[PDB]
Copies of this chain bind each other. A is one copy, B any other.
């Protein structure tokens, strides 16, 4: 439906909630703007150039970053996904993760890790803070990290700059992980 953009030996995999309608129409990841993703990617220095969506399949392999979603199926969204839907998708997400074994699995949007901790970990997770989360992806060495959804809808972070901290921090975490290798 909207194909993942995942390969092996990836530093970073970015996990999106469900693909939006624009995303489906263009068949490319995070093509909004206002989807803060691509701006943050540049600003954080994860990318040294400005990259629209169309550059998405050039990110594994040059940059180490892959795309996938927690729910494959198109939705407006995100308020319209069944609770069942999510936890059903948690299942298949994991399988990919353990198949592909990226260093860090970044969850885009808070709502998805909340459910993942429930369903995968069985942990309810009081007062979920962004960033590095203690539990490793089962049977892998992949670390989970949480970000605010890079969607303009998210009024508690207005601008891409507001979100950029998390992108930097992530890049930092990657860098460290590289050092212990």
Residues of A within 8 A of B (CB): 21-22, 25, 74, 76
Q: List, in ascending order, chain B residues with CB within 8 A of A25's CB.
A: 21, 74, 76
* SS of A interface (majority): helix
Complex Cα spacing A76 to B22, Å: 7
Q: List, in ascending order, chain B residues with CB within 8 A of A76's CB.
A: 22, 25
Q: List, in ascending order, chain B residues with CB within 8 A of A21's CB.
A: 21-22, 25
A180 smallest CB distance to B (angstroms)? 45
A76 smallest CB distance to B (angstroms)? 6
Q: Which residue of B lies closest to A26 (CB)?
A: B76
Complex Cα spacing A28 to B57, Å: 33
Q: Which residue of B lies closest to A74 (CB)?
A: B25
Complex Cα spacing A49 to B138, Å: 54
Complex Cα spacing A21 to B76, Å: 9
A27 smallest CB distance to B (angstroms)? 13
Complex Cα spacing A21 to B22, Å: 7
Complex Cα spacing A74 to B74, Å: 16
Pairs A-B, 6 closest by C-beta atoms? A21-B21, A21-B25, A25-B76, A22-B76, A21-B22, A25-B74
Q: List, in ascending order, chain B residues with CB within 8 A of A22's CB.
A: 21, 76
A177 smallest CB distance to B (angstroms)? 39
Complex Cα spacing A48 to B160, Å: 46
Complex Cα spacing A74 to B21, Å: 12
Complex Cα spacing A176 to B25, Å: 44
Q: Which residue of B lies closest to A31 (CB)?
A: B76
